[PDB]
Amino acid sequence: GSLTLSPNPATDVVTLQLTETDEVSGLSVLSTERSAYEIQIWSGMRMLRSFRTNEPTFQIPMAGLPAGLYFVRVVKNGQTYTQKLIKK
Ligand SMILES: [Cl-]
């Protein structure tokens, strides 16, 4: 499993992509499994907002959040992926 956030740095909308790494080719697949997951937006060791979706591609609204250092965390089937995200 892989997490990609675009663009970098974050504007009002961050596109999150959760692709499956194909076990044969090693290429990134946009899977039709569409399993539910949770996206958490963290800053200063506080979970500020969360979103729940089945879409591997999701636009995160960062509206209302000030400029600074954030962490985006995906919780999917027990597995977590966390990435530093700078909001300008
Ligand atoms: Cl944090």
Residue numbers in the entry: -2 to -1, 706 to 791
What did the article's authors report about this structure?
Gram-negative bacteria from the Bacteroidota phylum possess a type-IX secretion system (T9SS) for protein secretion, which requires cargoes to have a C-terminal domain (CTD). T9SS transport requires a C-terminal domain (CTD) of 70–100 residues, also known as the ‘T9SS signal’, which contrasts with the short unstructured signal peptides of other secretion systems. The CTD is apparently necessary and sufficient for T9SS secretion.
Eventually, the structure was solved in the primitive space group P3121 by single-wavelength anomalous diffraction (SAD) with data collected at the selenium K-edge, but it could only be refined in P31 after the diffraction data had been detwinned. Structure similarity searches with LKK identified the CTDs of PorZ (Z-score 10.0, rmsd 1.7 Å, 72 aligned residues, 18% identity; see) and PorU (Z-score 9.9, rmsd 1.9 Å, 78 aligned residues, 19% identity) as the closest structural relatives. We found that, in addition to the much longer Lβ2β3, LKK lacked one residue in motif Lβ3β4, which is relevant for T9SS function in P. gingivalis (see §2.3), and the conserved glycine was replaced with methionine. Moreover, the mutant strain evinced substantially less extracellular PPAD activity. This confirms that the CTDs are not functionally interchangeable between P. gingivalis and T. forsythia due to the disruption of motif Lβ3β4, despite both species belonging to the Bacteroidia class.
